[PDB]
């Protein structure tokens, strides 16, 4: 469908189709979810070690300059200087949104810097079924037209597909597909889940969201910690709650 | 010589300097993760750098090789400037490490030198195509590469029979003999291998 995209403007992925009942697991995740907590903070200027306890899952969505190639951008210089390893649990996971440029390399440097190894590369494949004749300006270094973003998965220490197909968001909208949360939550990796650089629009049960653009906070380190005091400490997120 | 050429050999031991310069190198190496694999050192020491001065490298990577291939790519003198993914479907156009099921294959794109005269921006970094045979790369990449670099000299490493393509010299051990037609190349091959045996 590549001689077709060059002809009609439809990206090869505009033609993938369909884009048993695993429903009970979803019920278990939902019953298990902590209430949402959130905290406005400027992450540049904030000691991350105050975020406690240590996290089972970190979802990290820094605002790359490339997200605003049409309309405070963080550089990979800035991202790399975060001390993620200070808030990661000894056995824990990271999901890092890397964009489609240097980030696919600088994001792997970050993963290694913080003590993870990449075991999954998740691709957000963006269709243009509603604007075929809208070819985008290219990175100077780009050979091809970039129609996807990558989200790198990292593990440290000891069902689904590695693709997300949705339609390209309207220019200036930076939201990532909410399906990233389903993939994450279906792994059953722990209940202490942190989204850095989330927004009001991303707040979600079972998640602690920290980000400079939040409008309200309800963070309390002690209240948050109580959700995981025994006998709730080592639950996966996908099990019956303890009576 | 537009028509397909190939050289059955061990790429570890063939002298690739005979082959000249190319505008595009493509390799689908057997990474060490059903056939003979090269260790990481054998891969780093491949003589990619003599193959190009100004041009592009297409490097299939899977698993652990997404990190090693980035290493070899930098070691050989390239900067990674794109990454193609092939979404694998069936004849009904639906989708088909140990943590997720892999519905794609990755191809790093690297640049070297100052390649000039290339129509960059004509294709997507997503290929969609039916999975032909197990461990077969999809024909659409050749078209993509042809649109990028029309009529230039190209070389594939670790090709299999069906990989032979016009404007392409394929190297690989599952090939049949030595089919060479470009006069400058049949010349350097006879000067470097008088008795025709690597
Ligand atoms: C000892 N040194 C050598 C060796 C040598 N060959 C080595 C043996 C080969 C033929 C060439 C290689 N291969 C092979 C199989 C699978 C892959 C993985 N890939 C992932 C990307 C893809 C989906 C687009 C295609 C499949 C990649 C490759 C063979 O099945 N057979 N040629 C010269 N010297
Ligand atoms: Mg779900």
Structural domains of chain A, ranges and CATH numbers in brackets: 2-226 (3.40.50)
Give CA separation, A227 vs A32, A39, A77, B143, in Å. Answer: 10, 17, 35, 56
- Rounded CA-CA distance A57/A92 in Å is 6
Is B127 in Cβ contact with A160 (below 8 Å)? no
DSSP code string of B30-56: ----------HHHHHHS-GGGG-SSEE
Query: What is the Cα–Cα distance from A187 to A95, expressed in whole angstroms?
Result: 12
Residue B121 and residue A140 in contact, taking contact as beta carbons nearer than 8 Å? no
CB atoms within 10 A of CB A94: 24
Instruction: Give the separation between CA B138 and CA B150, rounded to whole angstroms.
Output: 19
What does the alpha-carbon distance between residue A39 and residue B7 come to, in Å, rounded to a whole number? 63
DSSP for chain A, written as a single string: -HHHHHHH---GGGG-B----THHHHHHHHHHPPPPEEEE--GGGS-GGGS-S-EEEEEE---BGGGGS---PBPHHHHHTS-GGGTEEEEEEEEEEEESSTHHHHHHHHHHHTT-EEEEEEEEEEE-TT-TT-PPP--TT-SSB--EEEEEEEEE----BSEEEEEPPPTT--PPPTHHHHHHHHT---S-EEEET--GGG--TT-EEEETT-S-----HHHHHHTTSTTSTT--SSSPPP-
Instruction: Look at residues A152, A147, A188 and name the one whose alpha carbon lies nearest to residue A28.
Output: A188
Residues 6+ apart with CB under 8 A from A163: A122, A123, A125, B87, B95, B103, B104
CB atoms within 10 A of CB A71: 8
Residues 6+ apart with CB under 8 A from B56: A143, B23, B24, B25, B109, B110, B111, B112, B115, B118, B145, B148, B149
Tokens read off for B18: 């005979």
- Contacts of residue A233, Cβ cutoff 8 Å, sequence gap at least 6: none
The SS3 of residue B151 is coil
Q: What are phi and psi of A223, to 5 degrees?
A: -60, -40
Beta bridge partners of B126: B85
Phi/psi zone of residue A115: left (φ > 0), alpha (ψ -120 to 50 degrees), beta? left
The DSSP bridge pattern shows strands B168-172 and B154-157 to be parallel
Q: What is the DSSP letter of B166?
A: T
- Cα separation, A44 vs A82, in Å, equals 8
Positive/negative CA dihedral, B114, B117, B121, B127: negative
Distance CA A39, CA B148 (A): 48
User: A180 CA distance to ligand 2 centroid (A)?
Assistant: 9
Is B137 annotated in a binding site? The answer is yes
| Residue B146, domain extent | 1-198
The upper half-sphere exposure of residue A156, i.e. CA atoms within 13 Å in the direction of its Cβ, equals 24
Taking contacts as CB-CB distances below 8 angstroms, the residues of chain A near B70 are 105, 108
Q: Which DSSP letter does residue B71 get?
A: H
What is the side-by-side order of every strand in the sheet holding B79-89? Answer: B126-130, B79-89, B104-112, B55-61, B24-27, B154-157, B168-172, B5-8, B178-179
Cβ neighbors of B156 (< 8 A, separation 6 or more) are: B25, B26, B27, B28, B163, B165, B168, B169, B170, B171, B172
User: Is the CB of residue B111 less than 8 Å from the CB of residue B76?
Assistant: no
| CA separation for the pair A96, B6 (Å, rounded) | 42
Mention every residue, 6+ apart, whose C-beta is less than 8 A from residue B164.
B4, B5, B6, B170, B175
Which ligand is nearest to the Cα of residue B85, counting in written order? 1
Question: Helix A103-113 and helix B65-75: axis angle, to 10°?
Answer: 110
Task: Examine residue A231 and say whether the peptide bond preceding it is cis (omega within 30 degrees of 0).
Answer: yes
**A-contacting residues in B 156-185 (Cβ below 8 Å):** none
B101 is annotated as contributing to ligand binding:
no
Structure tokens at A28: 């278990």
Residue nearest (by alpha carbon) to ligand 1 atom 26: B135
| Helix locations, B102-182, DSSP H | 140-148
Count, residues in chain B: 198
Distances (CA, A) of A23 to A33, A184, A186, B94: 16, 15, 11, 22
Q: Which one, of A7, A9, A1, A2, lies nearest residue A129 by Cα?
A: A9
Contacts of A101 (CB under 8 A, 6+ apart): A66, A139, A141, A142, A146
Query: Bridge-partner residues for A99, per DSSP?
Result: A150
State how far Cα A51 lies from the chain centre: 18
The conformation of residue B177, written as its DSSP 8-state character, comes to S
Burial status of residue A227 (CB atoms within 10 A of its CB: 0-12, 13-18, 19 or more): middle
| CB B55, CB B112: distance < 8 Å | yes
Hey, which residues does A95 pair with through a beta bridge? A59, A153
- Give residues whose Cβ lies within 5 Å of ion ligand 2: A 182
Total structural domains within chain B: 1
The pair phi, psi for residue A65, each rounded to 5°, is -50, -30
Strand, coil or helix: what is B195? coil
Please state, as a whole number, how many other Cβ atoms lie within 10 Å of the Cβ of residue B145. Answer: 22
Task: Please give the Cα distance from A90 to A75 (Å, whole number).
Answer: 27
Distance (Å, rounded) from C-alpha A97 to C-alpha A121? 10
Q: Which residues contact A227 (CB under 8 A, 6 or more apart)?
A: A34, A35, A191
- Residue A53: asked if its preceding bond is cis (omega within 30°), the reply is yes
Among residues A117, A52, A122, the alpha carbon closest in space to that of A91 is found at A117
Number of helices (H) and strands (E), helices first, in chain B?
4, 9
Measured in angstroms, the CA of A29 and the nearest CA of chain B are apart by: 18
- Give the 3-state secondary structure of residue B68: helix
| DSSP one-letter code for B70 | H
Report CB contact under 8 Å: A104, B80.
yes
Q: Tell me the resolution in Å.
A: 2.5
* Helix orientation angle between A23-32 and A179-186, rounded to the nearest 10 degrees: 90
Do A138 and B77 touch, CB atoms closer than 8 A? no
B99 touches chain A (CB under 8 A): yes
Q: Please report, for residues A11, A81, A126, B85, B149, the alpha-carbon distance to residue B128 in angstroms, rounded to integers and kept in the order given.
A: 9, 37, 13, 9, 21
Which residues in chain A are immediately followed by a break of C to N over 2.5 Å?
19, 71, 158
């Amino acid at each position: 469908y590549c001689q077709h995209f060059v002809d009609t403007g439809h990206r090869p992925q505009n033609f993938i189709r369909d884009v048993e009942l695993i429903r009970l697991k979803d019920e278990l995740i939902a019953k298990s979810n902590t209430p949402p907590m959130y905290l406005q903070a400027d992450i540049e200027a904030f000691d991350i070690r105050e975020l406690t306890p240590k996290f089972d899952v970190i979802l990290l969505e820094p605002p790359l300059e490339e997200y605003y190639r049409e309309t405070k951008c963080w550089t990979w210089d800035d991202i790399m200087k975060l001390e993620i390893d200070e808030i990661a649990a000894p056995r824990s996971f990271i999901f890092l949104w890397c964009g489609s440029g240097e980030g696919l390399d600088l994001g792997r440097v970050c993963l290694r810097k913080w003590g993870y190894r990449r075991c999954e590369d998740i691709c957000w494949i963006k269709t243009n079924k509603n604007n075929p004749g809208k070819t985008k300006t290219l990175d100077p270094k780009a050979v091809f037209q970039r129609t996807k973003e990558h989200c790198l998965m990292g593990i440290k220490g000891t069902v689904d597909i590695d693709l997300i197909i949705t339609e390209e968001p309207e220019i200036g909208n930076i939201e990532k597909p909410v399906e990233i949360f389903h993939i994450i939550e279906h792994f059953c990796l722990g209940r202490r889940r942190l989204h850095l650089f989330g927004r009001d629009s991303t707040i979600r049960p079972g998640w602690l969201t920290v980000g400079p653009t939040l409008t309200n906070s309800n963070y309390n380190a002690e209240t948050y910690a109580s959700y995981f005091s025994a006998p709730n400490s080592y639950l996966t997120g996908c099990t019956e709650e303890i009576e | 010589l537009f028509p397909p050429q190939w050289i059955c050999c061990d790429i570890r031991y063939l002298d690739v300097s005979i082959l000249g310069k190319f505008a595009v190198v493509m390799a689908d190496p057997p990474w060490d993760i059903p056939y003979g694999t090269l260790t990481d050192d054998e891969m780093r020491r491949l003589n990619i750098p003599v193959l190009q001065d100004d041009g592009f490298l297409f490097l299939w990577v899977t698993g652990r090789a997404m990190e090693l291939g980035r290493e070899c790519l930098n070691l050989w003198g390239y900067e990674r400037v794109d990454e193609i993914i092939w979404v694998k479907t069936n004849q009904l156009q639906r989708i088909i490490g140990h943590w997720l099921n892999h519905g794609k294959e990755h191809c790093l794109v690297g640049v070297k030198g100052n390649p000039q005269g290339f129509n960059q921006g004509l294709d997507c970094d997503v290929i969609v195509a039916e999975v032909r045979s197990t461990s077969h790369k999809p024909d659409e990449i050749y078209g993509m590469i042809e649109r990028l670099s029309p009529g230039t000299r190209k070389i594939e490493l670790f090709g299999r029979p069906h990989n032979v393509q016009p404007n392409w010299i394929t190297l690989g051990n599952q090939l049949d003999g030595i089919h060479l037609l470009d006069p400058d190349v049949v010349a350097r091959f006879k000067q470097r291998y008088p008795d025709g045996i690597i």
